[PDB]
Amino acid sequence: KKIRTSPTFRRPKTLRLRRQPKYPRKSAPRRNKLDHYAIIKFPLTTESAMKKIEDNNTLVFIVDVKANKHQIKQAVKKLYDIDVAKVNTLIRPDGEKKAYVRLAPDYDALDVANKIGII
Amino acid sequence: GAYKYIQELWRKKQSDVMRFLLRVRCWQYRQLSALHRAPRPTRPDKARRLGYKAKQGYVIYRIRVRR
Amino acid sequence: KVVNPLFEKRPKNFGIGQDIQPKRDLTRFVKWPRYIRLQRQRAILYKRLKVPPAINQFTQVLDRQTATQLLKLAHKYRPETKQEKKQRLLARAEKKAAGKGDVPTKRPPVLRAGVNTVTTLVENKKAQLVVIAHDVDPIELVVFLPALCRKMGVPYCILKGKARLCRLVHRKTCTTVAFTQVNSEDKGALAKLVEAIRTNYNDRYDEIRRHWGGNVLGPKSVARIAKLEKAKAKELATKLG
Amino acid sequence: HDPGRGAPLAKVVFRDPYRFKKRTELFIAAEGIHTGQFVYCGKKAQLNI
RNA sequence: CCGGUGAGGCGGGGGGGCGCUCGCUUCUGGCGCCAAGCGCCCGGCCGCGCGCCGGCCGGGCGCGACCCGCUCCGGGGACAG
């Protein structure tokens, strides 16, 4: 005794189960190949880069194209034990990403450059 | 056995019974899609003679081809 | 007083151009799926078309009380299921050499399930009563069988539901069943069932052969033609007398 | 005005007596039909333009 | 085979009556849905206590909105194709 209110007959919602595989498709997860060491290739030591470092309290790095601003900021913080104010990324006409990492005013970009070795 | 009787029945296609059955089956099949999976054979005797076996793994598809 | 005067009536007039119609039943106007539509109009076609007697004979089904009696009688002769043949085999294995067991003893009479087996034993004239399901999807399986049983003098009856017939056996569906042998205790009941079945089926198989069935039009068309016939009867029904 | 058609069309709003909705139809405007006019459709409708 | 729709009231029957008739709407650029009324029951609390008694809170079903039917309504149709 269930009356049809509407003339249309939609497909009834049937129960659907989740995935319960008998065995994983892959034995182990693939190790991440975008770690903090792989993401950052090398800093730039050009005259413009040094002027940028000594004027705007920032740093210049070469990063893979696949990296995001969040990834670059986290990688810089993890590697150099520094706080990043912001990140500005661009792609040079060569295939390598250039990243201007503007640091927080508390830390000294020239001191960080001295520590990392570029001057 | 029933299979020989079924074979003779299918051989006597011009009879009224077989004519009615063929007409009803043709109408039902034409009312369906051009390729749908039949769950059981329409002609068990013909299926057995052609090699169909009533065991898992055997499938039967009914196909409508334009004349 | 326990009725607040603020309680009004506010009736709804469900007319044309008035308040909208209520949510009533619309099952007659549902756009049913193609398979439902096909399975309904197939039954409509079976009712409409002039069905040959060889297929129409299965519309003559067994009555409720006789069906219940036959099912009760066959309940004793239902075949052994799984986990029972295993028990019998293990019992015979343990009794092979435990108490001087030659294992020739006896096997009880059992029902016959397959159409091939039933046909073979009907042609051999070993059957005493054969039950045939009326709802086999391919009717080609059993059309000859009532005629063969009538020719061989084997009482045949038609039951409703291949599912019900195959529930006596331990499977899903079964087209035919046969009483090859029965116990002496149930011999009288089997004879009563046999005579009741042959009174209704075998003794009038000529009528069954000659009984075509069909030409049953839809109720709307029947009502229209009945109205036309009543009008033509009233044309000269009271004027002349 | 319907582009590519000489006759102007008329939008007429009815109320569907099955759901709480207002249906809209694009009739072909007969000569003399004006806005804010009631039009009646059906077997019992009066014989008016 | 063709048209319409969200395949929404198609065919019969007595229900209803101001008097065959309808599901009851035409002086106007307003509004109109997710039920009021009635009847039958259920769960928790409170007073009588004999509780299908009474009061409070929360719920179900039927009429309201007739019943039965085999093609959704129609237009062709043994012919177009």
Side-chain angles (χ1 to χ4, degrees), chain A, chain B, chain C residues 1-165 167-241, chain D:
Chain A
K1 278 294 300 177
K2 193 59 175 298
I3 53 99
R4 254 62 165 82
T5 300
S6 178
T8 57
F9 190 8
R10 283 288 190 173
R11 181 189 58 86
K13 290 172 57 63
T14 56
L15 172 60
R16 51 182 55 178
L17 303 178
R18 289 172 42 89
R19 284 288 186 88
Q20 295 296 289
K22 300 284 294 183
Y23 68 102
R25 308 303 153 180
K26 183 169 295 301
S27 60
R30 174 183 295 177
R31 51 176 294 269
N32 175 257
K33 298 183 178 182
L34 234 177
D35 206 0
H36 305 292
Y37 302 92
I39 180 184
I40 299 181
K41 297 182 179 181
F42 53 88
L44 286 184
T45 63
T46 74
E47 45 187 358
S48 302
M50 303 329 289
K51 183 170 58 181
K52 193 81 175 180
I53 292 177
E54 70 180 18
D55 293 357
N56 296 119
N57 194 88
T58 168
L59 300 174
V60 183
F61 297 108
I62 295 298
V63 192
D64 299 65
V65 295
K66 299 172 298 301
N68 303 334
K69 291 187 179 181
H70 299 284
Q71 291 187 290
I72 296 180
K73 178 185 179 65
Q74 293 175 178
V76 172
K77 178 173 302 179
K78 187 68 176 184
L79 292 180
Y80 301 139
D81 194 63
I82 200 181
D83 33 53
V84 172
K86 71 178 181 182
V87 178
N88 298 117
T89 60
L90 71 97
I91 295 186
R92 302 194 294 104
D94 296 319
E96 291 74 16
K97 178 171 297 182
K98 183 186 296 180
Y100 300 94
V101 175
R102 164 70 181 277
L103 321 170
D106 53 1
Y107 290 160
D108 184 66
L110 215 58
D111 181 66
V112 175
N114 295 328
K115 297 306 165 55
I116 65 184
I118 67 176
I119 197 57
Chain B
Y3 286 146
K4 184 155 296 181
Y5 285 91
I6 296 177
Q7 170 175 330
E8 300 296 80
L9 202 69
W10 269 103
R11 285 183 173 182
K12 302 300 180 181
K13 282 182 185 63
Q14 293 287 281
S15 60
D16 299 325
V17 185
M18 291 303 302
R19 168 181 291 183
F20 170 82
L21 289 172
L22 286 179
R23 180 153 47 191
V24 171
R25 264 71 166 275
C26 175
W27 165 87
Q28 181 181 2
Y29 302 158
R30 189 172 62 257
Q31 245 61 30
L32 294 175
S33 177
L35 187 142
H36 52 281
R37 178 205 175 187
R40 61 186 64 260
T42 306
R43 312 158 56 115
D45 54 324
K46 233 305 181 185
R48 296 186 55 78
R49 285 170 295 185
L50 292 181
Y52 170 83
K53 238 58 180 300
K55 56 179 60 181
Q56 300 174 351
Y58 279 74
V59 201
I60 23 191
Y61 270 78
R62 185 180 297 106
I63 288 83
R64 167 235 302 173
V65 47
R66 195 175 186 91
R67 267 162 151 253
Chain C
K1 198 172 297 183
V2 209
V3 44
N4 206 316
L6 278 310
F7 301 157
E8 296 188 4
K9 296 286 297 303
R10 314 176 187 92
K12 283 185 178 182
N13 189 275
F14 289 150
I16 294 190
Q18 313 285 0
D19 198 340
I20 67 175
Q21 307 298 328
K23 304 300 180 181
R24 55 172 58 94
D25 191 313
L26 299 175
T27 48
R28 249 194 61 96
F29 320 104
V30 174
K31 185 177 182 178
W32 298 101
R34 306 193 79 263
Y35 78 103
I36 293 177
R37 186 192 316 170
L38 174 143
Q39 72 177 354
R40 293 182 181 179
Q41 62 188 3
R42 189 184 69 255
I44 294 182
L45 281 177
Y46 267 90
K47 296 179 180 61
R48 189 76 72 262
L49 272 64
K50 187 162 51 62
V51 181
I55 309 178
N56 190 26
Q57 56 181 359
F58 292 85
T59 60
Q60 178 187 179
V61 289
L62 197 54
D63 63 84
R64 203 73 54 85
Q65 191 263 1
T66 309
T68 54
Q69 291 186 174
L70 213 165
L71 293 178
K72 290 180 180 180
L73 190 137
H75 197 77
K76 298 92 169 297
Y77 299 91
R78 297 172 71 259
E80 47 174 328
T81 176
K82 298 304 178 182
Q83 306 96 31
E84 306 294 77
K85 183 177 180 179
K86 173 87 67 177
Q87 286 179 355
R88 192 189 77 263
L89 288 182
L90 64 87
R92 299 321 300 180
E94 64 181 336
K95 298 297 295 182
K96 192 169 186 176
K100 205 75 173 185
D102 191 71
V103 201
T105 156
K106 263 305 295 181
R107 61 172 312 177
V110 205
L111 287 181
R112 298 283 188 169
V115 184
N116 297 268
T117 59
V118 168
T119 303
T120 51
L121 49 85
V122 162
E123 300 179 287
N124 289 332
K125 205 173 56 60
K126 297 184 178 301
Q128 307 175 4
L129 176 59
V130 281
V131 190
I132 302 171
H134 88 301
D135 58 330
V136 285
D137 192 7
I139 200 61
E140 317 278 12
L141 301 171
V142 43
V143 163
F144 64 96
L145 191 53
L148 176 64
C149 296
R150 202 273 180 181
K151 213 281 183 178
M152 283 296 182
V154 179
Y156 78 98
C157 58
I158 304 180
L159 259 194
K160 316 207 68 176
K162 55 180 178 298
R164 184 171 63 164
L165 187 53
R167 205 162 191 174
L168 292 175
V169 303
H170 302 267
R171 291 173 238 109
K172 295 187 301 182
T173 57
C174 192
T175 296
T176 327
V177 102
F179 296 92
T180 166
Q181 294 293 346
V182 291
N183 303 332
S184 302
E185 298 80 6
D186 306 69
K187 179 194 302 179
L190 191 272
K192 179 192 306 177
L193 291 188
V194 158
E195 68 94 77
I197 289 312
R198 68 164 57 256
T199 305
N200 191 23
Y201 285 89
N202 295 27
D203 281 65
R204 61 184 218 90
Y205 188 64
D206 302 329
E207 286 182 317
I208 300 181
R209 288 164 44 187
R210 295 304 183 91
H211 181 254
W212 278 74
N215 287 18
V216 185
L217 284 74
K220 191 174 304 180
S221 183
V222 171
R224 191 186 72 259
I225 192 61
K227 181 173 177 294
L228 264 299
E229 292 290 339
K230 187 174 182 178
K232 77 173 299 181
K234 195 181 59 58
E235 284 289 340
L236 291 179
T238 318
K239 312 294 182 177
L240 79 169
Chain D
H1 172 257
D2 190 299
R5 184 193 305 269
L9 302 181
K11 299 181 180 181
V12 183
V13 181
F14 300 90
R15 40 184 297 270
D16 179 67
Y18 304 108
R19 303 96 174 183
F20 179 72
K21 287 183 180 181
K22 280 185 171 58
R23 293 290 196 267
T24 60
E25 302 289 345
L26 255 179
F27 289 87
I28 292 193
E31 196 160 352
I33 295 184
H34 61 82
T35 57
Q37 178 183 352
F38 300 101
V39 298
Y40 300 83
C41 323
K43 191 173 65 64
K44 294 300 181 181
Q46 291 182 358
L47 208 285
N48 290 329
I49 293 185

mmCIF file of all heavy atoms in Angstrom, chain C residues 153-187, unseen atoms left out:
data_model
loop_
_atom_site.group_PDB
_atom_site.id
_atom_site.type_symbol
_atom_site.label_atom_id
_atom_site.label_comp_id
_atom_site.label_asym_id
_atom_site.label_seq_id
_atom_site.Cartn_x
_atom_site.Cartn_y
_atom_site.Cartn_z
ATOM 1 N N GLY C 153 -1.228 -43.459 -20.858
ATOM 2 C CA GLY C 153 -2.109 -43.752 -19.746
ATOM 3 C C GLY C 153 -1.570 -43.350 -18.393
ATOM 4 O O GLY C 153 -2.056 -43.844 -17.373
ATOM 5 N N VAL C 154 -0.580 -42.467 -18.354
ATOM 6 C CA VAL C 154 0.009 -42.000 -17.103
ATOM 7 C C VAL C 154 -0.771 -40.769 -16.647
ATOM 8 O O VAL C 154 -0.874 -39.800 -17.416
ATOM 9 C CB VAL C 154 1.497 -41.674 -17.266
ATOM 10 C CG1 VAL C 154 2.067 -41.168 -15.953
ATOM 11 C CG2 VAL C 154 2.257 -42.898 -17.748
ATOM 12 N N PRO C 155 -1.334 -40.767 -15.440
ATOM 13 C CA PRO C 155 -2.059 -39.581 -14.964
ATOM 14 C C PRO C 155 -1.132 -38.380 -14.834
ATOM 15 O O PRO C 155 -0.069 -38.458 -14.211
ATOM 16 C CB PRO C 155 -2.605 -40.025 -13.602
ATOM 17 C CG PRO C 155 -2.591 -41.519 -13.649
ATOM 18 C CD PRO C 155 -1.414 -41.887 -14.490
ATOM 19 N N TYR C 156 -1.550 -37.263 -15.425
ATOM 20 C CA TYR C 156 -0.775 -36.033 -15.409
ATOM 21 C C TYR C 156 -1.624 -34.902 -14.853
ATOM 22 O O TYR C 156 -2.812 -34.787 -15.171
ATOM 23 C CB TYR C 156 -0.266 -35.665 -16.813
ATOM 24 C CG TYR C 156 -1.308 -35.046 -17.717
ATOM 25 C CD1 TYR C 156 -1.388 -33.668 -17.874
ATOM 26 C CD2 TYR C 156 -2.206 -35.837 -18.420
ATOM 27 C CE1 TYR C 156 -2.336 -33.097 -18.698
ATOM 28 C CE2 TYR C 156 -3.157 -35.272 -19.249
ATOM 29 C CZ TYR C 156 -3.217 -33.902 -19.384
ATOM 30 O OH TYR C 156 -4.160 -33.333 -20.208
ATOM 31 N N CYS C 157 -1.009 -34.071 -14.020
ATOM 32 C CA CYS C 157 -1.657 -32.896 -13.464
ATOM 33 C C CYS C 157 -0.751 -31.691 -13.655
ATOM 34 O O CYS C 157 0.467 -31.822 -13.796
ATOM 35 C CB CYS C 157 -1.979 -33.072 -11.979
ATOM 36 S SG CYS C 157 -0.537 -33.412 -10.962
ATOM 37 N N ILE C 158 -1.363 -30.511 -13.660
ATOM 38 C CA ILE C 158 -0.653 -29.255 -13.858
ATOM 39 C C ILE C 158 -0.766 -28.438 -12.580
ATOM 40 O O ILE C 158 -1.876 -28.130 -12.127
ATOM 41 C CB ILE C 158 -1.202 -28.473 -15.061
ATOM 42 C CG1 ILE C 158 -1.144 -29.336 -16.321
ATOM 43 C CG2 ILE C 158 -0.412 -27.195 -15.261
ATOM 44 C CD1 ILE C 158 -1.663 -28.640 -17.556
ATOM 45 N N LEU C 159 0.377 -28.083 -12.005
ATOM 46 C CA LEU C 159 0.446 -27.283 -10.793
ATOM 47 C C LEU C 159 0.872 -25.853 -11.111
ATOM 48 O O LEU C 159 1.370 -25.547 -12.199
ATOM 49 C CB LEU C 159 1.414 -27.914 -9.787
ATOM 50 C CG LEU C 159 0.779 -28.707 -8.646
ATOM 51 C CD1 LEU C 159 1.798 -28.987 -7.553
ATOM 52 C CD2 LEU C 159 -0.412 -27.958 -8.092
ATOM 53 N N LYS C 160 0.666 -24.971 -10.133
ATOM 54 C CA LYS C 160 1.012 -23.561 -10.266
ATOM 55 C C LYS C 160 2.349 -23.306 -9.584
ATOM 56 O O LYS C 160 2.499 -23.557 -8.384
ATOM 57 C CB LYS C 160 -0.069 -22.668 -9.660
ATOM 58 C CG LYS C 160 -1.482 -23.073 -10.016
ATOM 59 C CD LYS C 160 -2.416 -21.880 -9.974
ATOM 60 C CE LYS C 160 -2.087 -20.899 -11.084
ATOM 61 N NZ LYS C 160 -3.053 -19.765 -11.129
ATOM 62 N N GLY C 161 3.315 -22.813 -10.351
ATOM 63 C CA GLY C 161 4.588 -22.415 -9.791
ATOM 64 C C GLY C 161 5.676 -23.452 -9.944
ATOM 65 O O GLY C 161 5.721 -24.440 -9.201
ATOM 66 N N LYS C 162 6.574 -23.229 -10.907
ATOM 67 C CA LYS C 162 7.765 -24.063 -10.994
ATOM 68 C C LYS C 162 8.632 -23.902 -9.754
ATOM 69 O O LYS C 162 9.315 -24.847 -9.352
ATOM 70 C CB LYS C 162 8.552 -23.732 -12.263
ATOM 71 C CG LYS C 162 8.929 -22.268 -12.410
ATOM 72 C CD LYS C 162 9.714 -22.044 -13.691
ATOM 73 C CE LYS C 162 10.057 -20.579 -13.891
ATOM 74 N NZ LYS C 162 8.840 -19.732 -14.018
ATOM 75 N N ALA C 163 8.594 -22.728 -9.123
ATOM 76 C CA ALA C 163 9.283 -22.548 -7.849
ATOM 77 C C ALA C 163 8.702 -23.455 -6.772
ATOM 78 O O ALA C 163 9.446 -24.095 -6.020
ATOM 79 C CB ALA C 163 9.197 -21.087 -7.415
ATOM 80 N N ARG C 164 7.373 -23.524 -6.681
ATOM 81 C CA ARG C 164 6.757 -24.398 -5.689
ATOM 82 C C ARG C 164 7.048 -25.861 -5.994
ATOM 83 O O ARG C 164 7.294 -26.656 -5.080
ATOM 84 C CB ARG C 164 5.250 -24.148 -5.620
ATOM 85 C CG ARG C 164 4.554 -24.958 -4.538
ATOM 86 C CD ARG C 164 3.107 -24.541 -4.345
ATOM 87 N NE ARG C 164 2.298 -24.767 -5.537
ATOM 88 C CZ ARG C 164 0.970 -24.781 -5.542
ATOM 89 N NH1 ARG C 164 0.301 -24.593 -4.414
ATOM 90 N NH2 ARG C 164 0.309 -24.992 -6.672
ATOM 91 N N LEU C 165 7.024 -26.235 -7.276
ATOM 92 C CA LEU C 165 7.330 -27.615 -7.643
ATOM 93 C C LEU C 165 8.776 -27.978 -7.328
ATOM 94 O O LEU C 165 9.045 -29.082 -6.839
ATOM 95 C CB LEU C 165 7.035 -27.846 -9.124
ATOM 96 C CG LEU C 165 7.163 -29.295 -9.602
ATOM 97 C CD1 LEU C 165 6.328 -30.220 -8.732
ATOM 98 C CD2 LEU C 165 6.757 -29.424 -11.059
ATOM 99 N N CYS C 166 9.713 -27.072 -7.593
ATOM 100 C CA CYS C 166 11.113 -27.293 -7.312
ATOM 101 C C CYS C 166 11.533 -27.026 -5.892
ATOM 102 O O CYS C 166 12.706 -27.209 -5.559
ATOM 103 N N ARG C 167 10.622 -26.555 -5.046
ATOM 104 C CA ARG C 167 10.902 -26.500 -3.619
ATOM 105 C C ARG C 167 10.723 -27.851 -2.942
ATOM 106 O O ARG C 167 11.290 -28.069 -1.864
ATOM 107 C CB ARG C 167 10.011 -25.455 -2.940
ATOM 108 C CG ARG C 167 10.597 -24.904 -1.651
ATOM 109 C CD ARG C 167 9.934 -23.597 -1.250
ATOM 110 N NE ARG C 167 10.648 -22.937 -0.160
ATOM 111 C CZ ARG C 167 10.347 -21.729 0.305
ATOM 112 N NH1 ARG C 167 9.342 -21.046 -0.224
ATOM 113 N NH2 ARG C 167 11.050 -21.204 1.300
ATOM 114 N N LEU C 168 9.953 -28.761 -3.549
ATOM 115 C CA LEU C 168 9.916 -30.139 -3.069
ATOM 116 C C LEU C 168 11.292 -30.781 -3.172
ATOM 117 O O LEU C 168 11.748 -31.452 -2.239
ATOM 118 C CB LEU C 168 8.889 -30.944 -3.861
ATOM 119 C CG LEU C 168 7.417 -30.586 -3.658
ATOM 120 C CD1 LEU C 168 6.534 -31.382 -4.606
ATOM 121 C CD2 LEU C 168 7.007 -30.826 -2.215
ATOM 122 N N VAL C 169 11.964 -30.590 -4.304
ATOM 123 C CA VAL C 169 13.382 -30.903 -4.397
ATOM 124 C C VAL C 169 14.185 -29.745 -3.812
ATOM 125 O O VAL C 169 13.655 -28.674 -3.513
ATOM 126 C CB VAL C 169 13.796 -31.197 -5.849
ATOM 127 C CG1 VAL C 169 12.960 -32.329 -6.420
ATOM 128 C CG2 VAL C 169 13.656 -29.952 -6.703
ATOM 129 N N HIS C 170 15.478 -29.969 -3.624
ATOM 130 C CA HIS C 170 16.334 -28.962 -2.999
ATOM 131 C C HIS C 170 17.078 -28.148 -4.058
ATOM 132 O O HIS C 170 18.306 -28.087 -4.101
ATOM 133 C CB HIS C 170 17.288 -29.628 -2.016
ATOM 134 C CG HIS C 170 16.586 -30.400 -0.943
ATOM 135 N ND1 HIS C 170 16.257 -29.851 0.277
ATOM 136 C CD2 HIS C 170 16.128 -31.675 -0.917
ATOM 137 C CE1 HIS C 170 15.637 -30.757 1.013
ATOM 138 N NE2 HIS C 170 15.548 -31.872 0.312
ATOM 139 N N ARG C 171 16.290 -27.512 -4.925
ATOM 140 C CA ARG C 171 16.803 -26.645 -5.975
ATOM 141 C C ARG C 171 15.881 -25.440 -6.101
ATOM 142 O O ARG C 171 14.946 -25.263 -5.315
ATOM 143 C CB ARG C 171 16.933 -27.402 -7.303
ATOM 144 C CG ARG C 171 18.021 -28.464 -7.296
ATOM 145 C CD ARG C 171 18.015 -29.296 -8.563
ATOM 146 N NE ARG C 171 17.831 -30.713 -8.267
ATOM 147 C CZ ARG C 171 16.722 -31.396 -8.528
ATOM 148 N NH1 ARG C 171 15.692 -30.795 -9.108
ATOM 149 N NH2 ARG C 171 16.645 -32.681 -8.217
ATOM 150 N N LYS C 172 16.152 -24.599 -7.101
ATOM 151 C CA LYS C 172 15.359 -23.387 -7.287
ATOM 152 C C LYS C 172 14.054 -23.683 -8.020
ATOM 153 O O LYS C 172 12.965 -23.402 -7.509
ATOM 154 C CB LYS C 172 16.176 -22.332 -8.039
ATOM 155 C CG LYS C 172 17.391 -21.830 -7.276
ATOM 156 C CD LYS C 172 18.066 -20.677 -8.000
ATOM 157 C CE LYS C 172 18.525 -21.086 -9.390
ATOM 158 N NZ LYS C 172 19.228 -19.976 -10.091
ATOM 159 N N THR C 173 14.146 -24.249 -9.220
ATOM 160 C CA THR C 173 12.975 -24.563 -10.024
ATOM 161 C C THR C 173 13.079 -25.984 -10.557
ATOM 162 O O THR C 173 14.176 -26.515 -10.754
ATOM 163 C CB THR C 173 12.811 -23.590 -11.204
ATOM 164 O OG1 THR C 173 13.996 -23.606 -12.010
ATOM 165 C CG2 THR C 173 12.563 -22.178 -10.705
ATOM 166 N N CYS C 174 11.919 -26.595 -10.787
ATOM 167 C CA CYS C 174 11.852 -27.923 -11.380
ATOM 168 C C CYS C 174 10.599 -28.000 -12.235
ATOM 169 O O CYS C 174 9.499 -27.705 -11.756
ATOM 170 C CB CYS C 174 11.844 -29.016 -10.309
ATOM 171 S SG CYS C 174 12.102 -30.680 -10.947
ATOM 172 N N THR C 175 10.769 -28.395 -13.497
ATOM 173 C CA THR C 175 9.652 -28.378 -14.435
ATOM 174 C C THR C 175 8.660 -29.501 -14.154
ATOM 175 O O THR C 175 7.443 -29.290 -14.214
ATOM 176 C CB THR C 175 10.174 -28.469 -15.869
ATOM 177 O OG1 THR C 175 10.948 -27.302 -16.172
ATOM 178 C CG2 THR C 175 9.024 -28.587 -16.858
ATOM 179 N N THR C 176 9.153 -30.698 -13.845
ATOM 180 C CA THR C 176 8.304 -31.873 -13.723
ATOM 181 C C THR C 176 8.677 -32.663 -12.476
ATOM 182 O O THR C 176 9.784 -32.546 -11.947
ATOM 183 C CB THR C 176 8.417 -32.772 -14.964
ATOM 184 O OG1 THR C 176 8.647 -31.961 -16.122
ATOM 185 C CG2 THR C 176 7.136 -33.564 -15.169
ATOM 186 N N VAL C 177 7.721 -33.457 -11.998
ATOM 187 C CA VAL C 177 7.959 -34.401 -10.913
ATOM 188 C C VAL C 177 7.137 -35.649 -11.195
ATOM 189 O O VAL C 177 6.097 -35.588 -11.855
ATOM 190 C CB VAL C 177 7.626 -33.790 -9.528
ATOM 191 C CG1 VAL C 177 6.275 -34.276 -9.022
ATOM 192 C CG2 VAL C 177 8.724 -34.113 -8.530
ATOM 193 N N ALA C 178 7.615 -36.792 -10.709
ATOM 194 C CA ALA C 178 6.972 -38.065 -11.000
ATOM 195 C C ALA C 178 6.963 -38.950 -9.764
ATOM 196 O O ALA C 178 7.943 -38.994 -9.015
ATOM 197 C CB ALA C 178 7.679 -38.792 -12.151
ATOM 198 N N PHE C 179 5.851 -39.658 -9.562
ATOM 199 C CA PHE C 179 5.717 -40.632 -8.480
ATOM 200 C C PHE C 179 5.918 -42.019 -9.079
ATOM 201 O O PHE C 179 4.962 -42.693 -9.465
ATOM 202 C CB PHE C 179 4.359 -40.511 -7.796
ATOM 203 C CG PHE C 179 4.139 -39.197 -7.105
ATOM 204 C CD1 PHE C 179 3.527 -38.145 -7.765
ATOM 205 C CD2 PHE C 179 4.535 -39.017 -5.791
ATOM 206 C CE1 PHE C 179 3.321 -36.936 -7.129
ATOM 207 C CE2 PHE C 179 4.333 -37.811 -5.151
ATOM 208 C CZ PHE C 179 3.725 -36.770 -5.821
ATOM 209 N N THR C 180 7.179 -42.447 -9.164
ATOM 210 C CA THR C 180 7.463 -43.774 -9.701
ATOM 211 C C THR C 180 6.962 -44.869 -8.765
ATOM 212 O O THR C 180 6.361 -45.850 -9.217
ATOM 213 C CB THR C 180 8.962 -43.930 -9.967
ATOM 214 O OG1 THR C 180 9.271 -45.313 -10.183
ATOM 215 C CG2 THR C 180 9.785 -43.400 -8.799
ATOM 216 N N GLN C 181 7.190 -44.716 -7.462
ATOM 217 C CA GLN C 181 6.727 -45.672 -6.467
ATOM 218 C C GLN C 181 6.339 -44.928 -5.200
ATOM 219 O O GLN C 181 6.858 -43.846 -4.912
ATOM 220 C CB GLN C 181 7.796 -46.729 -6.139
ATOM 221 C CG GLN C 181 8.140 -47.674 -7.282
ATOM 222 C CD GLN C 181 6.995 -48.598 -7.653
ATOM 223 O OE1 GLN C 181 6.023 -48.736 -6.909
ATOM 224 N NE2 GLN C 181 7.105 -49.240 -8.810
ATOM 225 N N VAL C 182 5.418 -45.522 -4.440
ATOM 226 C CA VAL C 182 4.967 -44.968 -3.171
ATOM 227 C C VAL C 182 4.912 -46.083 -2.136
ATOM 228 O O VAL C 182 4.860 -47.269 -2.466
ATOM 229 C CB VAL C 182 3.591 -44.277 -3.282
ATOM 230 C CG1 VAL C 182 3.698 -43.002 -4.104
ATOM 231 C CG2 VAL C 182 2.571 -45.225 -3.889
ATOM 232 N N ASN C 183 4.924 -45.683 -0.869
ATOM 233 C CA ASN C 183 4.867 -46.642 0.220
ATOM 234 C C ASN C 183 3.468 -47.242 0.339
ATOM 235 O O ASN C 183 2.477 -46.686 -0.144
ATOM 236 C CB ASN C 183 5.268 -45.982 1.538
ATOM 237 C CG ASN C 183 6.644 -45.355 1.477
ATOM 238 O OD1 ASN C 183 7.508 -45.797 0.719
ATOM 239 N ND2 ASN C 183 6.858 -44.315 2.276
ATOM 240 N N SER C 184 3.400 -48.405 0.991
ATOM 241 C CA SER C 184 2.116 -49.068 1.190
ATOM 242 C C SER C 184 1.187 -48.244 2.072
ATOM 243 O O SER C 184 -0.035 -48.288 1.893
ATOM 244 C CB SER C 184 2.330 -50.454 1.797
ATOM 245 O OG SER C 184 3.155 -51.251 0.966
ATOM 246 N N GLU C 185 1.744 -47.500 3.031
ATOM 247 C CA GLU C 185 0.919 -46.652 3.886
ATOM 248 C C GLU C 185 0.248 -45.544 3.082
ATOM 249 O O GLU C 185 -0.926 -45.228 3.306
ATOM 250 C CB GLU C 185 1.764 -46.058 5.014
ATOM 251 C CG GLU C 185 2.376 -47.083 5.960
ATOM 252 C CD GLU C 185 3.625 -47.738 5.398
ATOM 253 O OE1 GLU C 185 4.084 -47.319 4.313
ATOM 254 O OE2 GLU C 185 4.147 -48.672 6.040
ATOM 255 N N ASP C 186 0.977 -44.947 2.144
ATOM 256 C CA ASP C 186 0.466 -43.860 1.321
ATOM 257 C C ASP C 186 -0.134 -44.345 0.007
ATOM 258 O O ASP C 186 -0.480 -43.519 -0.844
ATOM 259 C CB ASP C 186 1.578 -42.849 1.039
ATOM 260 C CG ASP C 186 2.241 -42.346 2.307
ATOM 261 O OD1 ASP C 186 2.947 -43.137 2.966
ATOM 262 O OD2 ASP C 186 2.057 -41.158 2.643
ATOM 263 N N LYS C 187 -0.244 -45.664 -0.182
ATOM 264 C CA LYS C 187 -0.789 -46.198 -1.427
ATOM 265 C C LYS C 187 -2.226 -45.743 -1.652
ATOM 266 O O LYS C 187 -2.602 -45.386 -2.774
ATOM 267 C CB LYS C 187 -0.709 -47.724 -1.417
ATOM 268 C CG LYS C 187 -1.267 -48.381 -2.668
ATOM 269 C CD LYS C 187 -1.482 -49.872 -2.463
ATOM 270 C CE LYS C 187 -0.192 -50.572 -2.068
ATOM 271 N NZ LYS C 187 -0.399 -52.029 -1.845
#
